[PDB]
Amino acid sequence: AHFPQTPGFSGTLRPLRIEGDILDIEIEGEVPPQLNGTFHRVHPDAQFPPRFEDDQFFNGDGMVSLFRFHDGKIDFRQRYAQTDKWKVERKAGKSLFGAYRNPLTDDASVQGMIRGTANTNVMVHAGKLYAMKEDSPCLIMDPLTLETEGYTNFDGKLQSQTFCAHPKIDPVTGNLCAFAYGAKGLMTLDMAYIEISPTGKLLKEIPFQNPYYCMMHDFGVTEDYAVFAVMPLLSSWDRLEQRLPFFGFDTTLPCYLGILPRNGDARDLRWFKTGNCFVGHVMNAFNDGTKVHIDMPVSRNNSFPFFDVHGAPFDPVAGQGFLTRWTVDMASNGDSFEKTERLFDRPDEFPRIDERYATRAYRHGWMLILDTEKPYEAPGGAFYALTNTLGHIDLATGKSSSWWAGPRCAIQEPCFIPRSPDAPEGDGYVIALVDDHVANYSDLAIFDAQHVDQGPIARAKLPVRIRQGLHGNWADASRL
Amino acid sequence: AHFPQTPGFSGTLRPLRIEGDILDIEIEGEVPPQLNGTFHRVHPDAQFPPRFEDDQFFNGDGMVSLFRFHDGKIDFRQRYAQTDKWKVERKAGKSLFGAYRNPLTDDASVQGMIRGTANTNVMVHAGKLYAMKEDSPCLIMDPLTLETEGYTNFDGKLQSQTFCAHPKIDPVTGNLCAFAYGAKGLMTLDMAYIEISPTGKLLKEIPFQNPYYCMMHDFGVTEDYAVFAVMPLLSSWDRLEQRLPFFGFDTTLPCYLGILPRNGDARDLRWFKTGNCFVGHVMNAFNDGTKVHIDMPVSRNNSFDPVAGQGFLTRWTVDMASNGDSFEKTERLFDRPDEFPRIDERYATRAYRHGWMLILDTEKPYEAPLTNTLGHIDLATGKSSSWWAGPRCAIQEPCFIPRSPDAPEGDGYVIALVDDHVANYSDLAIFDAQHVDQGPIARAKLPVRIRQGLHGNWADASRL
Numbered sequence: 001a002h003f004p005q006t007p008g009f010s011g012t013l014r015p016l017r018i019e020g021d022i023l024d025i026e027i028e029g030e031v032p033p034q035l036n037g038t039f040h041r042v043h044p045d046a047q048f049p050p051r052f053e054d055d056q057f058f059n060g061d062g063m064v065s066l067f068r069f070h071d072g073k074i075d076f077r078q079r080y081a082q083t084d085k086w087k088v089e090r091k092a093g094k095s096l097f098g099a100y101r102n103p104l105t106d107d108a109s110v111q112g113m114i115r116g117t118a119n120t121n122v123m124v125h126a127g128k129l130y131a132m133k134e135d136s137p138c139l140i141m142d143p144l145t146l147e148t149e150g151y152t153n154f155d156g157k158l159q160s161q162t163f164c165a166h167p168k169i170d171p172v173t174g175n176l177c178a179f180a181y182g183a184k185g186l187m188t189l190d191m192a193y194i195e196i197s198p199t200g201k202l203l204k205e206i207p208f209q210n211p212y213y214c215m216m217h218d219f220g221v222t223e224d225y226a227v228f229a230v231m232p233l234l235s236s237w238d239r240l241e242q243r244l245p246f247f248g249f250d251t252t253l254p255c256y257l258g259i260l261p262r263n264g265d266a267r268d269l270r271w272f273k274t275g276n277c278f279v280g281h282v283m284n285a286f287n288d289g290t291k292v293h294i295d296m297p298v299s300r301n302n303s304f305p306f307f308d309v310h311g312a313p314f315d316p317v318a319g320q321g322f323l324t325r326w327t328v329d330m331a332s333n334g335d336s337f338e339k340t341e342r343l344f345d346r347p348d349e350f351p352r353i354d355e356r357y358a359t360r361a362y363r364h365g366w367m368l369i370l371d372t373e374k375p376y377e378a379p380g381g382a383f384y385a386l387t388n389t390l391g392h393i394d395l396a397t398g399k400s401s402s403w404w405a406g407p408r409c410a411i412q413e414p415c416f417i418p419r420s421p422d423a424p425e426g427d428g429y430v431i432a433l434v435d436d437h438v439a440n441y442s443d444l445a446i447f448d449a450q451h452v453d454q455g456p457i458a459r460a461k462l463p464v465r466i467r468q469g470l471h472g473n474w475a476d477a478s479r480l
Numbered sequence: 481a482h483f484p485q486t487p488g489f490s491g492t493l494r495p496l497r498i499e500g501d502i503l504d505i506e507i508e509g510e511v512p513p514q515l516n517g518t519f520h521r522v523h524p525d526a527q528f529p530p531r532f533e534d535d536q537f538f539n540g541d542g543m544v545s546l547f548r549f550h551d552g553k554i555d556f557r558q559r560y561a562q563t564d565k566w567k568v569e570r571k572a573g574k575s576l577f578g579a580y581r582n583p584l585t586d587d588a589s590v591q592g593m594i595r596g597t598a599n600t601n602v603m604v605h606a607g608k609l610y611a612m613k614e615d616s617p618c619l620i621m622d623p624l625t626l627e628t629e630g631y632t633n634f635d636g637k638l639q640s641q642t643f644c645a646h647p648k649i650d651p652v653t654g655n656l657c658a659f660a661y662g663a664k665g666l667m668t669l670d671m672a673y674i675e676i677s678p679t680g681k682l683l684k685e686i687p688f689q690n691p692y693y694c695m696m697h698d699f700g701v702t703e704d705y706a707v708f709a710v711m712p713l714l715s716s717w718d719r720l721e722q723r724l725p726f727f728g729f730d731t732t733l734p735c736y737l738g739i740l741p742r743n744g745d746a747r748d749l750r751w752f753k754t755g756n757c758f759v760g761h762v763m764n765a766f767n768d769g770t771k772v773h774i775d776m777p778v779s780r781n782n783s784f785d786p787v788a789g790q791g792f793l794t795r796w797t798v799d800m801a802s803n804g805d806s807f808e809k810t811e812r813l814f815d816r817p818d819e820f821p822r823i824d825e826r827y828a829t830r831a832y833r834h835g836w837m838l839i840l841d842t843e844k845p846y847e848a849p850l851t852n853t854l855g856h857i858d859l860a861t862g863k864s865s866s867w868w869a870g871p872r873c874a875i876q877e878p879c880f881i882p883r884s885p886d887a888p889e890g891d892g893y894v895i896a897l898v899d900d901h902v903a904n905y906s907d908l909a910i911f912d913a914q915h916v917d918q919g920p921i922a923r924a925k926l927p928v929r930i931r932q933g934l935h936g937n938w939a940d941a942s943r944l
């Protein structure tokens with residue numbers, strides 16, 4: 001009823017909190033008639049006002065959106081993920097859990113509960129929808145009704161208390177390749193590489209130890225290795241008692257890259273070391289023999305201003321991430337990299353690939369671009385987190401193109417859809433939410449993947465603006 | 481999925497069509513904590529693009545909104561009324577029924593089906609929600625889930641094929657007082673005065689004939705009489721054959737006022753005649769002995785030419801004791817163009833003085849790419865006050881809530897949706913009924929603009 005009038009809950013970040021349905025969205029243009037599948041997507045949307053006036057973006061309850069493609073039509077369905085947190089807070093009619101990653105600020109009635117909001121990523125696997133949040137197990141939902149089944153441990157087999165929100169689909173085995181940090185609770189170095197079969201059975205859970213008490217948000221998977229990028233985004237329980245941000249970036253410590261053979265154990269894990277930097281989302285990773293490549297935006301400090309870290313304001317220029325390839329060789333001796341190479345010279349994040357080529361050699365990528373030289377005429381919005389541009393890069397040529405959403409709009413994470421199962425790499429479509437911050441409408445815009453610069457070929461016009469979310473995924477109807 | 485690019489489906493009249501819920505709406509100010517009940521409300525919202533690009537606003541599928549008040553909180557729930565039309569069209573994934581009230585344009589697959597959209601009014605009665613559209617039976621829904629149960633003939637008793645969307649609640653008996661026109665199908669002169677008990681049982685269905693086939697949208701109920709305003713808004717099968725709009729107003733025919741004793745029959749009905757004009761919604765009606773008063777906006781032509789469409793709240797007076805068919809009085813009650821009148825319905829059918837209305841203030845700026853004013857009139861003194869919503873907003877039909885059961889007439893709150901046509905958000909504004917010029921005392925802030933609707937009603941939780 002009464003949300004704190006902090007910027008975190010006002011203007012373009014106002015609460016939405018509407019579950020609902022639209023049958024047959026209004027289309028401007030023509031939805032590609034062959035497309036038949038689901039595009040899932042999630043945003044934080046605190047059900048009730050927070051205990052803390054300062055409660056953060058990534059702490060809001062997960063609101064899941066479904067866009068079902070079929071017969072040149074798109075349907076809309078949106079539901080709260082009914083996490084243990086969400087269920088108990090609804091019964092109380094108020095928020096019971098506290099600050100971000102801080103159980104010391106929880107109400108006494110919910111101590112020991114799973115504090116996850118399932119607000120970071122949603123992906124179809126094993127005929128179900130996996131709703132994910134780092135600090136908590138995987139939440140199982142129905143891909144079409146968006147009903148919540150409950151957290152899972154994969155029939156008692158998984159020991160890890162947590163489950164990452166950035167798994168990859170092995171394009172050969174169809175296995176869900178995931179991982180977990182803090183696998184034995186907050187502030188533990190216990191890690192795990194996880195593979196889930198196409199029918200939901202836990203196949204392997206390879207434990208190992210991390211170099212830091214740090215955040216491990218994303219990782220890479222190659223044909224033979226799991227790739228873990230370790231940054232000094234450090235955590236400490238002292239900070240929670242002082243009521244400071246759980247994570248704080250240390251600009252003096254180095255970064256590591258851990259290569260775990262997917263068929264080995266912690267004994268075979270080799271650590272490589274490089275200079276200090278901030279590592280973003282992994283576009284893709286792949287190995288050529290013992291040569292391992294991983295592509296991700298690299299910046300000098302935190303790239304997300306909604307992500308409150310401790311110490312040293314928010315440097316918006318030091319937070320500019322550029323798509324960078326890291327290369328190590330398992331055949332070499334020592335912990336030296338072979339190569340670091342900037343792949344793209346514009347600040348970017350939220351990278352995407354033709355997922356048929358995940359874990360393999362590839363050339364086509366899409367990304368959100370921060371074009372600060374463009375006007376932004378929408379009052380009530382952070383100019384910092386303004387992804388106003390969609391970009392495409394041909395890594396084989398370095399050529400790139402982009403599209404500007406205009407001065408009224410932001411763009412959310414894109415997603416690639418192939419034109420057909422055996423279409424060439426990157427031949428198909430890119431979809432993304434384009435949010436008009438003046439009229440408060442959202443379009444699910446459809447681009448030609450190879451000509452994003454020509455603007456959308458179609459727009460699914462929603463009569464509502466979807467709150468800025470995180471990650472989404474496309475699944476063909478055959479996966480259901 | 482491809483709606484026409486006409487004005488009736490673009491801009492502020494864009495399709496909405498979202499069913500959904502919000503628990504604990506954002507509140508600016510304070511929702512009066514005593515309030516515990518429901519505000520229902522409905523707008524047209526075609527589920528699929530129409531068969532004809534010039535489809536009327538009034539032809540769209542009914543979308544019902546629920547605002548459940550409790551303990552200073554308001555929850556939101558919005559659902560489609562699952563009429564026979566809506567169900568079959570969803571099955572087919574496209575619009576099967578054709579032009580407004582024109583069965584000659586329906587697809588063959590739905591011929592003889594009920595063409596109602598239930599898009600005009602929603603009112604709690606006998607523990608259920610009555611969803612109404614003139615050309616069709618009453619639709620029964622659940623007041624809290626907004627589930628649909630189906631059309632009703634009240635246990636097979638009701639003979640009328642139709643059921644009005646403007647019933648009044650008798651403040652003494654608790655009966656739902658309704659009527660029906662075209663009761664034996666389209667273009668039929670058959671009429672009926674209807675009463676439904678507080679438990680849903682049909683108590684009386686009094687048939688009579690209408691002076692001609694015309695729109696009979698609203699009517700009045702007094703302590704002793706039912707009051708039927710007849711204007712020459714005509715329709716014939718011939719109009720439908722030429723694919724003209726169903727209704728066509730005739731400037732040369734007179735208007736009638738038919739007074740029917742509630743406990744009598746068609747032989748006891750008296751017709752009074754007056755000059756040509758266009759009649760609008762009924763604020764209220766009452767009788768003082770044999771003198772019958774009815775207050776309603778009156779204009780020269782359709783208000784539902786902007787100058788001819790200017791309707792002014794007017795009182796019509798006839799005397800049942802008199803001989804002949806002359807009125808006694810016609811008196812303009814308000815000098816500003818107005819519509820959607822409302823009263824403290826605890827005084828419905830009885831003498832009253834407090835009314836609320838929407839006012840079209842043409843001297844105000846509108847900065848969007850129009851009811852912009854909420855009014856209050858004290859009929860005992862002619863005094864009035866109003867509130868302008870600003871250059872970006874419009875106001876939908878208001879509705880009165882008494883501060884308490886024993887409160888004096890007009891003592892309480894007036895609620896209405898206020899729509900920002902630039903930011904595309906809607907607020908459920910709460911005013912003090914006696915000081916609407918002071919602006920809202922509270923705003924329930926929706927993260928969406930509710931489409932332009934029709935009629936809504938308040939019901940205390942005790943009625944659930």
Ligand SMILES: [Fe+3]
Pocket residue numbers: 120166217281470471
């Ligand atoms: Fe992420």
Ligand SMILES: [Fe+3]
Pocket residue numbers: 600646697761934935
């Ligand atoms: Fe009406």
Ligand SMILES: [Mg+2]
Pocket residue numbers: 441442443460461462463464
């Ligand atoms: Mg739109």
